[model samples]
Target: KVFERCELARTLKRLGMDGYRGISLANWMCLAKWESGYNTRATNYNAGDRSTDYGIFQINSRFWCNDGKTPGAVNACHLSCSALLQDNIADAVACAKRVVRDPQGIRAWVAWRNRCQNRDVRQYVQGCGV
Candidate 1:
């Protein structure tokens, strides 16, 4: 399938993110669903006209590929998918886990969601299994 939510969930689980006592898989899943719909090949159409961000994590391709200086940079392609896939979910879940582990706890994510304050983003926090 073009966008595989279950596959993404399994990837997150294998990374040890599914069982974190302090972190919510539901919240991570909601973020992933909203961010990329589990599509590792996803790209943001609305990013800057000449930007290089790509993949499920939406990491900037310029950092990986060195886009502006070099056109058709294949280096970015390697980073695009590699960073998004992993042997376990830890690779996928590290960023969120780190946020929760911070002194502010999961509220860091909550605060982030609040900054958006849009109806859709607000709904994500409510659905986070808090």
Candidate 2:
């Protein structure tokens, strides 16, 4: 379910999240790249914590979706964890928005911390022309 970068930009904008608040499209694009390398099917297992992260935004079963593998999940978005792995990312975008509403904001994503925190990422969407 990998897609062209600009296609992702267009789709996300359609979800009303492009540059939502102070977070720019470039920031969102950078987060997606680091989280899953823009591969929709990406999933990461955290054996030590017994939880898993799913999809491009790497929404986690611990607080986001119910995949049944993670114990005591909240399913905050009322989603099956696999839903985020779909090629169409409407659900992922919605859930990611919900996650970002948390007090920690984008800190929900460690990838953001490691790769995108306070960094300029305008180049990620510079030529996408979205």
Candidate 3:
């Protein structure tokens, strides 16, 4: 399901990511926007390397999920990649929380690195009040 702007903020808040651990809720929102345009079913099969990024958070197959298509992948999340394409994002949320706990924080997302990094994104959460 495609989520609206405010709906995503509320969902992220419930998922323990509403401004989670110094990571801004707006930054999360913006990351979601830039990465997937709120499309829960989004997938990017990077043809060059054959590593696919999955769902709204774009978790990589190289180290996150074992989709079978990506051979020799390390299944860190221990979940099927198809699980991430569903409207329910519980699996993705759980995995993403782990991702942010890493040193780079949200910088793991190339979209966040390029667009949402090192800036005030408070306006992204203005209406949601997250």
Candidate 4:
């Protein structure tokens, strides 16, 4: 019953049932690893206010959540549980799908990597399962 890696895979398969059939499971793993290291309750302190960015995907709770409900706060969550639950592979994949759809998502990431000038990180991201 525990939602481990296998469970995460199953959840992703179910979550991407409709709109995101092209996304691969490996891609989801890459996103989750990059965003939150699979930590469901991860929060980013880099934000100036120190607000909790919740879930495996590290989505800002304030932006994504509405009335502090688990799944109802963000419109993104309405599409799938990955938008709702933290540390869930399905949510991570859904978020990645959204990012890939955006024309600037990969470009922005590339720009950031170029700024850092870290050849290793850039290569890693380049080969990352996106």
Query: What is the lDDT, from 0 to 100, of the residue 1 in candidate 3?
Result: 78
Alpha-carbon deviation at 127 in model 1, angstroms: 15
Clashes of 4: 4
TM-score computed on alpha carbons, candidate 3? 0.93
User: Which has the greatest lDDT?
Assistant: 2
What C-alpha lDDT, on a 0 to 100 scale, does residue 40 get in candidate 3? Answer: 95
lDDT per residue for candidate 1 within 5-120, as digits (tens), equals 55655556567765475554555566566556656556654344455444454444443433343344444233333454443334335544543565765444343375432334
Report lDDT (CA) for all predictions.
Answer: 0.48, 0.87, 0.86, 0.47
**TM-score of each model, paired residue for residue:** 0.46, 0.94, 0.93, 0.47
- Give per-candidate clash totals: 5, 0, 0, 4
Candidate 1 regions exceeding 4 Å error are: 1-3, 19-21, 45-51, 61-82, 85-130
lDDT of 2 by residue, 12-111 (tens): 8778887675577888999999888899999999998899999989888999999997887799999999899999899999898889888888787888
Give me the candidate number with maximum TM-score: 2
List, residue by residue over 3-54, the lDDT tens digit for candidate 4.
4454454556567622353534544544445665566766554355433454
lDDT of 3: 0.86
Off by over 4 Å in 3: none
lDDT of 4 at 47: 54
Q: Sort by lDDT, best first: what order?
A: 2, 3, 1, 4
RMSD of 2: 1.1
